[PDB]
Amino acid sequence: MKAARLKFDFQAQSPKELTLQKGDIVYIHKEVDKNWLEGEHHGRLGIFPANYVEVLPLE
Numbered sequence: 001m002k003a004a005r006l007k008f009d010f011q012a013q014s015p016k017e018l019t020l021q022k023g024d025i026v027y028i029h030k031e032v033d034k035n036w037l038e039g040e041h042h043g044r045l046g047i048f049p050a051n052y053v054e055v056l057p058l059e
Helices: none
Strands: 003-006 025-031 037-041 044-048 053-055
Touching: 025 037
Parallel strands: none
Antiparallel strands: 003 025, 003 053, 037 044
16 A cells, blocks of 8 residues: 655654654555655554655565
């Protein structure tokens, strides 16, 4: 369902946001072009600016 791998160390600022460093891959459900992508991993939800990752669904 469209995957994206982080390419820049990002730090969560809000309780809803999730902190993840480069190399981390998450499964995004819907693409919010508003300027914030919504994703969830291991039961936990982690959101961050779409300008902090590159689109490239890996295997």
